[PDB]
Every structure is written in C-alpha cells, then in structure tokens.
Amino acid sequence: SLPIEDNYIREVVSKLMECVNDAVQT
Amino acid sequence: LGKVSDKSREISEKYIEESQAIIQELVKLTMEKLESKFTKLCDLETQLEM
C-alpha cells in the first residue's frame, strides 16, 4: 500500500498499388 | 504527358457527348414555353378584332 512516485508512472506510461498500376499505364 | 493528353482527348470527347444532349434538351424544353405564348398571341387576333 505504499505510494509510487509520479516520475516512475510517467516513465512506465492495399491503397499503394491502386495508383502505381494506373500511373504506369497512363 | 503525351499519354495523359491522349487520355484527356477522349475524356473531352466524352464531355462533348455530355454537353450536346443537354443543349438539345434545352432546345426541346424552350418549345412548349414558346407554344403557350403562341396560344396567348393567337387569342389577340380576336381580342383586337372585337
């Protein structure tokens, strides 16, 4: 039940190919 | 860029085909609004003779 410091708590705490194949063609 | 322009040429042809039907539909829809005024005009041929 002892408290813990805050500095330890703050220490612990397919769309790509849709355009390429179209840019190669057109 | 030549391939992009060749695609855009047929897209522009698609928009020519898009625009001409709208122009023809405007020309059709003008006619009935004109014809109602033609009937209003033909009433005057007796309304003035009276």
From Swiss-Prot, chain B:
Classify the source by domain of life.
Eukaryota
Subcellular location per the Swiss-Prot or TrEMBL entry: Nucleus
Q: How does it assemble?
A: Dimerizes via the C-terminal coiled coil. Interacts directly with HTL1, NPL6, RSC6 and the N-terminus of STH1. Component of the two forms of the RSC complex composed of at least either RSC1 or RSC2, and ARP7, ARP9, LDB7, NPL6, RSC3, RSC30, RSC4, RSC58, RSC6, RSC8, RSC9, SFH1, STH1, HTL1 and probably RTT102. The complexes interact with histone and histone variant components of centromeric chromatin.
Purpose: Component of the chromatin structure-remodeling complex (RSC), which is involved in transcription regulation and nucleosome positioning. RSC is responsible for the transfer of a histone octamer from a nucleosome core particle to naked DNA. The reaction requires ATP and involves an activated RSC-nucleosome intermediate. Remodeling reaction also involves DNA translocation, DNA twist and conformational change.
User: What more does the record tell us?
Assistant: Present with 3380 molecules/cell in log phase SD medium.
Q: What is this protein called?
A: Chromatin structure-remodeling complex protein RSC8
Q: What organism is recorded for this protein?
A: Saccharomyces cerevisiae (strain ATCC 204508 / S288c) (Baker's yeast)
Q: Which residues of the full protein are shown?
A: 407 to 456 of 557
